[PDB]
Amino acid sequence: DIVMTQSPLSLPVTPGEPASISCKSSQSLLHSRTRKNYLAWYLQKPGQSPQLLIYWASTRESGVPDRFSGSGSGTDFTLKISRVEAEDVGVYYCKQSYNLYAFGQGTKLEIKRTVAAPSVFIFPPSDEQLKSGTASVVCLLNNFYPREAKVQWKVDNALQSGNSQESVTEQDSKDSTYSLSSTLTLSKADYEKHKVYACEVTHQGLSSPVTKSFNRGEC
Amino acid sequence: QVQLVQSGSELKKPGASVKVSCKASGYTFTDDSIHWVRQAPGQGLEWMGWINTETGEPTYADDFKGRFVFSLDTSVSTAYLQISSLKAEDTAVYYCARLSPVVVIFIYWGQGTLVTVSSASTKGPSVFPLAPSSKSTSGGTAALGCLVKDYFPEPVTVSWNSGALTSGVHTFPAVLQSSGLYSLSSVVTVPSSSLGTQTYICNVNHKPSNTKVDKKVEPKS
Amino acid sequence: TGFVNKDQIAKDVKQFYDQALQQAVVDDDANNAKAVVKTFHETLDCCGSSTLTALTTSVLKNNLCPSGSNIISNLFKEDCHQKIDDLFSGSH
């Protein structure tokens, strides 16, 4: 069929700066009779259904601010935002309707901020949890940017794998930072067999990988 | 005003069926076709197909030809999406949309219906403290939190001091464990000078299990 | 103004349509403009203006174009400038 491709798939913009999203289709979207390019741009904001921004490649829908503009024809199309504002964050999709319907992968427009190093914290398992036969060690990366960051779990300097969950929050509305929580799950038996538990964080804001550790049974 | 209102969230076990409704208002329902779009959690939009609101004939997209049925009831201006033999990968948000002609776009959408398919059973969470210490103090600010683990199904609401403490709070999205249950953590950053004078209690409320647990996170000596 | 003025007359008719179309969506007292645009759409089997494309959705929101989206033949409708041209020329 017709395949849609968007670039880039993740676009962080400094507020007030312009933004551009490219959209390319496998086949031409130009109708020979109507002379229209049946390509549209939708924006899906967090927790909302998609809304129509642009249709026929370059016609702006009623009510959409003038800073949104569409252009292109045939197979190459572009969505431009003259001044990116805070309310514009969300996933932008291009969709063709020349033959059937197909959406692009989507471009997540986020806010660009200065690099911020994460604050790393480690919480050992609670006494209540150990009574159930399982332990969870939590590593917290707090308020950092960009999102790209690596966490590694070392138990007695032994790198762990396949036993850690990872969760990241959406970009904070006030300071535009991210937070991540990694949780290492172990059995109480296999937890009490070792002493040192640590998480090593690698991020652009850190000159060197920051290691946060604790010895089991030390206050 | 044109409105497409879909039915509420659905929770099913692998192998059952589910029927989502999409009621239209504000325009002649039988003029324009009704299209369906699926969105897996954290994934993009995918067109599933459409249904002719005048004849009732469905047209399915190649990736959705099989276990999906587009049905219709014009007496109440309602389209229906049915899924039989539900599998785990069917968990997603399903939107209906009205196709406008000439421009050939989706101006009017529904709020979407979440369908969750999991062999797990309803279960209240477990709340453990994540106590602050000297490993949790950075620049006079200490981090504390609560770990809400082993609970199905979402959602779970977490508050601090009965909603009085909001600054510095981060409640992470739940992560699905290998056991089929969910687990998340709610952390908060507070001045470490108030650990001896201020008390911090996280209130976890899980409605699918009618569970309300208030766990006070005390610092570890 | 007659046969040898084809291009001019068509240009005027298109302009007339535009005016009606603009009046039909901008205001709700303009019922004659709405009737005019509906008659153009139905008689010429068209919908919208090639110069006032940004108005198309408004035109649809006002139910000025008679065909829905169930029939694929009606999804891709030509604007009325093309249909006016086809009317004043012999072919399409």
Numbering used by the authors:
A (entry chain B): 1 to 219
B (entry chain A): 1 to 221
C (entry chain C): 111 to 202
Provide text from the study.
Members of the tetraspanin protein family share an overall domain organization consisting of four transmembrane segments, a small extracellular loop (SEL), a large extracellular loop (LEL) containing a conserved Cys-Cys-Gly (CCG) motif, a short cytoplasmic N-terminal region, and a C-terminal cytoplasmic tail. CD81 plays a critical role in regulating B cell receptor (BCR) signaling as one subunit of the B cell co-receptor complex, which also includes CD19 and CD21. Within this complex, CD81 directly interacts with CD19, a single-pass transmembrane protein that establishes the threshold for both BCR dependent and independent signaling. Remarkably, the anti-CD81 antibody 5A6, which binds selectively to activated B cells, recognizes an unusual conformational epitope on CD81 that is masked when CD81 is in complex with CD19, but which becomes accessible upon B cell activation.
To gain insight into the molecular basis underlying the unique reactivity of the 5A6 antibody, we determined the structure of the 5A6 Fab in complex with the large extracellular loop (LEL) of CD81 to 2.4 Å resolution using x-ray crystallography. The overall architecture of the CD81 LEL has five helices, with the A, B and E helices as a stalk and helices C and D capping the ‘top’ face. The 5A6 Fab binds CD81 at an epitope derived almost exclusively from helices C and D, burying a total of 1522 Å﻿ of solvent accessible surface area. The paratope of 5A6 is derived from all three heavy chain complementarity-determining regions (CDRs; residues 31–35, 50–66, 99–108) and from the first two light light-chain CDRs (residues 24–40 and 55–61). The most striking feature of the contact interface is the large-scale rearrangement of the CD81 C and D helices, which splay apart in the structure of the complex. Helix C moves outward by approximately 7 Å, and Helix D unravels almost completely and moves outward by approximately 11 Å, compared to its position in the structure of free full-length CD81. This structural rearrangement occurs because the heavy chain of 5A6 inserts its CDR3 loop between the helices, allowing it to form polar contacts with S179 and N180. Additional key interactions at the Fab-CD81 interface include extensive light-chain contacts with helix C of CD81. Among these interactions are hydrogen-bonds between the side chain hydroxyl group of Fab residue Y55 with the T167 side chain hydroxyl, the T167 backbone amide, and the T163 backbone carbonyl of CD81. The light chain of 5A6 also contacts three residues at the start of Helix E, forming a hydrogen bonding network with residues E188, D189, and Q192 of CD81.
